[PDB]
Write a sequence for this structure.
């Protein structure tokens, strides 16, 4: 109940939201149907429109007008944005030459450059080039400022998840806005686009930028705008707030446009109807920049032009129906569209079985346009599992498609030609970033980056300490002229042991065999030198990884590879080796097919055993350093050490053996040598973080050998591929993956075919950042390069996406 009989007199677009039942005059009062009776009359004036005309110049102030052309308007801060152009012979901002802004040029009393975030819904990255002829204001911000070719959204590529990630620096699984539609089983409550449940603060986790600012004494404008407030009025309100007294004036502001998303859904991303919305957004940017120029703020404010996601061609005829796969379609609830989330219709249905639903949706039709996943099996780069609002069953929908439960859902609710929500590496989902202002760089192109990084940067721009978030603070320092964040590398928590030869062969009762009984002072000396680390410089190019948790591990050196061997998890945490462009691939010799060799540096009590693998009828083993890439027949014996062995399902070994035998040498050929770091990951609680021992759900039968959930590899080379990876003077190039350790290849519908037809497709889907591997392992890589630490942080955030232009 609201007492709407109160008044918005002297309260229009007030920043402090007032308590029911008192009536409101803030920019969301319309959305809560709570505005005072006179809000439209006082706060949403439209009389004479939005532009000064020659006949209005020097007019007697009429308080009824939407904006003013009277001599007093600049001091009142309520001129039409074109006032000085029409009435005082000034130029539009867009007609001024670009001039580097080296320092803030602010009015007296400004304590910091304000930040204005200009957010555009559904603004696909390629609009910056394809729409450039119709967006001159945006093209000036882009060319004169700091721009990325695109910015990667979070999954799902929906509005609320992405705007709240921009606000918080968090993945949706952490901030809790995991879709535009959600059911929380603990609250027993549903969140929807339409309705009032979404205004309950219990949905929204983390600490958004406006709260971070307010808590640190930095005032914020209200970021959300009721849809009925015209864009011109949003701009004039921001310009009016910027004219407040010093003690009252916010330092951070947001503008939001529902376009071009609104038109893109109707017409498709490149429908001819899309030109006019892009022209209208550009005109709005021009109104803001002209307005700032009038207030002498156009060389004072930092401006961010940023989108939430892109837009794909999607039509009603490209819909998959679950009714074509499931017998039981009325016993499920589907969250539908550009992703699918399935749960039981009723928690009283004891016959609901996720396993039978997954099996019924798996590789059933030759051109099937979705793939089912248990959420823990989704690519780790999506960080889309650790939230009770994310249903256990997920459908990853192909670009250009929808999934629905039954056909009547599509025609009892064709219309639309555009949609978004797909995998955040899809080119059509990419969006925009431009920064313009004293704190940003001038005429600078930066590599594409992820929207989780921008919270940290917006905190840097405002002198705020960020709340804990999923950005890597310092990874975007190359966007900034000043206010860079200069972190120190994390302290190593656990120092390695360096064991020598300490055990005789007969102390080991592992059930292993090897045909290695084969008997020289020259080469005796070399073998000893290799074990002491004589080749370590070749194979550990960037220093050993630091272990950032308390554990017991050993460094083990070999001719061809170095490892950090866990005495707790009975396997390497990491295995590092370098393969030159010239490297030769060899076989596992017949006589060594089943060879496993005790490591006389490592106690039998801290070793795996072969009998466990014999007894476990599901689990086999592989090797982290590949015997295929041995430097010599003698060095090959090292690759069969029990300390190089890891548990692998036969299905996984098909992938792993093809990676090791074919793909590593292909990458060394293509990149002029590669350095590889490989290892296990344990994430049984799907939280993206290194498991403790007590979280491990599966062991090799009858043993204490834990089974990884994933295997990673980090593949590094010289960005200048004319230099070999092991003699690189400059910046590095990385690609990584986190492959799921699964007992079948059901994810790969073509897995009956030769590994050349499906293994690389799998690896591309499970591409990763080094930072994703750092979270999952508690290791810190690249500690000893001759590169800037911020450059290394940028490298650690890189994702190799495998999308064409
Ligand atoms: C991305 O960045 C974020 C931010 O840094 C990282 O997330 C953090 O991860 C930490 C480890 O998972 C986590 O730490 C836990 O915090 C608990 C306190 O949590 C409350 O307070 C904080 C601070 O204000 C607040 O942010 C939290 O907000 C979460 O929860 C509310 C819902 O209640 C949500 O609205 C909000 O969206 C957010 O939810 C997200 O996180 C929770 C986990 O907190 C998930 O369950 C959600 O799905 C969602 O992902 C909270 O309001 C603290 O109690 C925990 O401590 C317990 O566990 C540790 C184990 O190490 C143990 O040592 C302690 O003894 C303690 O154990 C006791 O509780 C156990 C569980 O009940 C029980 O089993 C034991 O027996 C004991 O009784 C823990 O410290 C931190 O909260 C989140 N923060 C956020 C914002 O998500 C994230 O990891 C990064 N991602 C990657 C991939 O790097
Ligand atoms: C179903 C549905 C979806 N979407 C919307 N719309 C209403 C609205 C109104 N205002 C905003 N303002 C945005 C919020 C935000 C967050 C971070 C940053 Cl950096 C800038 C901004 C500015 N966003 C929105 C989103 N409504 C309904
Ligand atoms: Ca959107
Ligand atoms: Ca974990
Ligand atoms: K076995
Ligand atoms: Na298969
Ligand atoms: Zn949309």
């Amino acid at each position: 109940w609201t007492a709407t009989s109160g008044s918005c007199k002297g309260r229009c677009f007030e920043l402090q939201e007032v308590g029911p039942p008192d009536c409101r005059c803030d920019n969301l009062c319309k959305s809560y149907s709570s505005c005072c009776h006179d809000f439209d009359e006082l706060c949403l004036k439209t009389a004479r429109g939005w532009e000064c005309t020659k006949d209005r110049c020097g007019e007697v102030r009429n308080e009824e007008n939407a904006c003013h052309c009277s001599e007093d308007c600049l001091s009142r801060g309520d001129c039409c944005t074109n006032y000085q152009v029409v009435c005082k012979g000034e130029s539009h901002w867009v007609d001024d030459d670009c001039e580097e802004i080296k320092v803030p040029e602010c009015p007296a009393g400004f304590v910091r450059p304000p930040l204005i975030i200009f957010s555009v819904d559904g603004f696909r990255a390629s609009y910056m080039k394809k729409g450039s002829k119709v967006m001159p204001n945006i093209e000036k911000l882009r060319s004169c400022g700091t721009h990325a070719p695109y910015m990667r959204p979070v999954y799902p590529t929906k509005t609320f998840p992405n705007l709240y990630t921009l606000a918080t620096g968090l993945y949706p699984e952490s901030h809790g806005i995991v879709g535009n539609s959600m059911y929380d089983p603990v609250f027993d409550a549903s969140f929807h686009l339409r309705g009032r449940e979404k205004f309950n603060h219990r949905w929204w986790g983390g600490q958004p930028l406006w709260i971070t600012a307010t808590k640190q004494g930095v005032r914020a404008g209200t970021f959300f705008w009721s849809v009925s407030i015209p864009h011109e009025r949003r701009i004039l309100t921001i310009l009016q707030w910027l004219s407040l007294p010093d003690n009252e004036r916010p330092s951070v502001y947001a503008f939001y446009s529902e376009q071009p998303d609104f038109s893109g859904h109707k017409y498709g991303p490149f429908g001819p109807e899309m030109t006019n919305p892009l022209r209208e957004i550009d005109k709005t940017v021009g109104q803001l920049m002209d307005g700032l120029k009038q207030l002498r703020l156009h060389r004072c404010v930092n401006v961010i032009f940023v989108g939430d996601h892109g837009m794909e061609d999607v039509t009603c005829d490209r819909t998959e129906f679950l009714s074509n796969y499931l017998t039981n379609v009325d016993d499920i609830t589907l969250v539908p569209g550009t992703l699918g989330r399935i749960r039981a219709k009723s928690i009283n249905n004891s016959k609901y079985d996720p396993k039978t639903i997954i099996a019924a949706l798996t590789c059933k039709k030759p051109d099937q346009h979705f793939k089912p996943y248990m959420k823990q099996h989704l690519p780790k780069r999506l960080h889309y599992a650790n939230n009770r609002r994310i249903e256990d069953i997920h459908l990853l929908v192909d670009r250009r498609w929808h999934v629905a439960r039954k056909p009547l859902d599509v025609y009892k609710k064709c219309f639309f030609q555009g949609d978004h929500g797909f995998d955040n590496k899809v080119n059509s989902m990419q969006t925009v970033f431009v920064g313009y202002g004293p704190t940003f760089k001038y005429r600078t192109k930066v590599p594409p980056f992820e929207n989780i990084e921008l919270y940290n940067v917006m905190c840097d721009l405002l002198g705020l300490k960020p709340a804990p978030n999923n950005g890597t603070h310092g990874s975007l320092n190359h966007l900034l002229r000043t206010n860079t964040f200069r972190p120190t590398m994390p302290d190593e928590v656990s120092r390695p042991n360096y064991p020598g030869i300490m055990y005789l062969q007969s102390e080991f009762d592992l059930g292993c065999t090897c045909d290695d009984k084969v008997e020289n002072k020259l080469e005796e000396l070399n073998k000893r030198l290799h074990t002491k680390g004589s080749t370590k410089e070749r194979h550990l190019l960037y220093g050993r990884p630091a272990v950032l948790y308390r554990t017991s591990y050993d460094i083990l050196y070999h001719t061809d590879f170095e490892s950090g061997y866990s005495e707790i998890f009975l396997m390497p945490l990491w295995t590092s080796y370098t393969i030159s462009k010239q490297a030769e691939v060899s076989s596992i010799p017949e006589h060594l097919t089943n060879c496993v060799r005790p490591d006389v540096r490592v106690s039998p009590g801290f070793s795996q055993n072969c009998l466990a693998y014999k007894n476990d009828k599901q689990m086999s083993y592989g090797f982290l350093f590949p015997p295929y890439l041995s430097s010599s027949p003698e060095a090959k014996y090292d690759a069969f050490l029990v300390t190089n062995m890891v548990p692998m399902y036969p299905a996984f070994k098909r992938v792993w053996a093809y990676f090791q035998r074919v793909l590593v040498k292909k990458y060394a050929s293509e990149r002029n040598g590669v350095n590889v770091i490989s290892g296990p990951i344990f994430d049984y609680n799907y939280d993206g973080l290194r498991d403790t021992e007590d979280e491990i759900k599966q062991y090799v039968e009858g043993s204490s050998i834990p089974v990884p959930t994933h295997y990673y590899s980090i593949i590094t080379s010289c960005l200048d591929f004319t230099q070999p990876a092991d003699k690189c003077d400059g910046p590095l190039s990385v690609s990584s993956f986190i492959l799921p350790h699964r007992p079948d290849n059901d994810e790969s519908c073509n897995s009956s075919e030769d590994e050349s037809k499906w293994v690389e497709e799998l690896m591309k889907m499970h591409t990763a950042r080094v930072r994703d591997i750092e979270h999952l392992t508690g290791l810190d890589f690249y500690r000893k390069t001759s590169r800037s630490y911020s450059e290394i942080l940028t490298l650690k955030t890189y994702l190799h996406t495998y999308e064409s232009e």
Notes: The first strand starts at residue 115 and ends at 121.
